[PDB]
């Protein structure tokens, strides 16, 4: 019984791990995009010196 339950378990950590890998790339990237978003506002806000 435990061969199945464990060996299935083994993949999940592996799979969950790689999923976590791209996520942080996304999470940090999303902050970067938001960091960008601000930068977009600044230059138009800069343009607001009408």
């Amino acid at each position: 019984r435990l061969e199945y339950e464990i060996k299935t378990l083994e993949q999940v950590k592996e799979s969950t791990s790689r999923a976590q890998e791209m996520t942080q790339n996304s999470m940090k990237a999303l902050q970067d995009m938001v960091k960008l978003l601000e930068d977009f506002k600044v230059k138009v806000t800069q343009a607001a010196s009408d």
Partner: protein, 50 residues
């Protein structure tokens, strides 16, 4: 069990290569690795039957 535990785990990686190709749906290499596990099972299957 020497081969039984090994062969169920071999079948387990047959299953795991799917997880990897699922995680890497593009690369044929993951297929190739996955494919061999596939008939690897069938090979043993035909081995026992005979």
């Amino acid at each position: 069990d020497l081969q039984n535990t090994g062969i169920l785990q071999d079948l387990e990686n047959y299953n795991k290569a799917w997880n990897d190709f699922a995680s890497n749906p593009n690369e044929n290499a993951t297929k190739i690795a996955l494919v061999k596990a596939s008939q690897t099972l069938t090979e043993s299957v035909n081995n026992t039957f005979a």
